Design a protein around this ligand. Structure first.
Ligand SMILES: O=C(O)CNC(=O)C(=O)O
Ligand SMILES: [Cl-]
Ligand SMILES: [Mn+2]
Length: 332
């Protein structure tokens, strides 16, 4: 079974998403609470379905709210095409008071459980090509999601954050989710209208603590980097809460939950600190076009888009983690 290791030997990378024997290798990492990466998923999909132009053409007239990733401001009652038309074409992006193009995220779209209903062909294309299908598919035999009683697909679409100032901002702030999930990068858009940003992208992953083999995927492989993830083991979540309670009190704090508050992005400062002061070393992961990231239930994580990303995630409930999922459901 074709695979290799990233993050200095600590992250499994599976290279063939439809290899039936994948579970054997996957499960050993997964039962220890490690995330897992599967590359090559884009090569299985119907490309034409996962274009920003197609999303604009087909659903542009819908009403939506957006989020400015730099200041968290909400842009109320805008149109879907406003987002998608500026995904790669910088001059088409909605502008702040100062007339500058904004780095934006599309909020709650599609809304509710409307994905399957709103996008049936995309739904079938994703689900027919998810890796580890017995775990990940709604009706997969190791997916307990639908098999349990009432006590246990989402898009993440946003532009990139490339500046030096941007490096301490999250596309999605540190949080955890209650079930297992797989997050697939189905499209990476390289924006035009400000010239090349390759060196900023590279300095951002380096400062994000990415390993040398991850960086060869750019230098040698010439792969298109989508997003930079930091993921932590579910067990390490309290040690991370402890750090953030303290740091927060150093600007005026309650015995509350910083991870649930989803207000923190761990920059290179706090990550060195979390490691030396709490022993906690996470996984710095660059998600390229076609990479599927498996995030264990309750494993805290944050995301920082480098370029413009179309991501689609499927939740599931594995036997290995079904106790976590139960315990996380009650606390949440
Ligand atoms: O992609 C993002 O911005 C955030 N993704 C997730 O939080 C996830 O898959 O759980
Ligand atoms: Cl499987
Ligand atoms: Mn998440």
């Amino acid at each position: 079974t074709s695979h290799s290791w990233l993050c200095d030997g600590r992250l499994l990378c599976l290279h063939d998403p439809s290899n039936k024997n994948n579970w054997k290798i996957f499960r050993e990492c997964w039962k220890q609470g490690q995330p897992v990466l599967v590359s090559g998923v884009h090569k299985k999909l119907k490309s034409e379905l996962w274009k920003p132009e197609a999303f604009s053409q087909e659903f542009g007239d819908q009403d939506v709210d957006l989020v400015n990733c730099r200041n968290c401001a909400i842009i109320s009652d805008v149109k879907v095409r406003d987002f998608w038309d500026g995904f790669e074409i910088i001059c088409k992006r909605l502008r702040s008071e100062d007339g500058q193009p904004m780095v934006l995220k599309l909020k709650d779209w599609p809304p509710g459980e409307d994905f399957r209903d709103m996008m049936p062909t995309r739904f079938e294309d994703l689900m027919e090509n998810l890796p580890l299908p017995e775990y990940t598919k709604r009706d997969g035999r190791l997916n307990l999601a639908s098999r349990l009683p009432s006590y246990f697909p989402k898009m993440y679409n946003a532009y990139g954050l490339i500046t030096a100032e941007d490096r301490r901002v999250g596309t999605t702030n540190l949080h955890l989710d209650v079930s297992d999930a797989v997050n697939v990068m189905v499209y990476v858009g390289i924006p035009i209208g400000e010239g090349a940003h390759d060196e900023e992208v590279l300095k951002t992953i380096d400062e994000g603590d990415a390993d040398e083999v991850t960086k060869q995927r750019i230098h040698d492989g010439k792969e298109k980097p989508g997003a930079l993830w930091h993921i932590y083991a579910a067990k390490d979540a309290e040690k991370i809460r402890e750090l953030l309670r303290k740091v927060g009190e150093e600007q005026g704090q309650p015995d509350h939950d910083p991870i649930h508050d989803q207000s923190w992005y761990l920059d290179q400062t706090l990550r060195k600190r979390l490691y030396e002061e709490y022993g906690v070393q996470g996984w710095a992961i660059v998600q390229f076009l076609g990479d599927a990231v498996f995030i264990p239930a309750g494993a805290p994580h944050q995301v920082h888009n480098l370029y413009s990303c179309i991501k689609v995630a499927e939740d599931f409930v594995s036997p290995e983690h079904v106790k976590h999922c139960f315990r996380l459901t009650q606390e949440f």
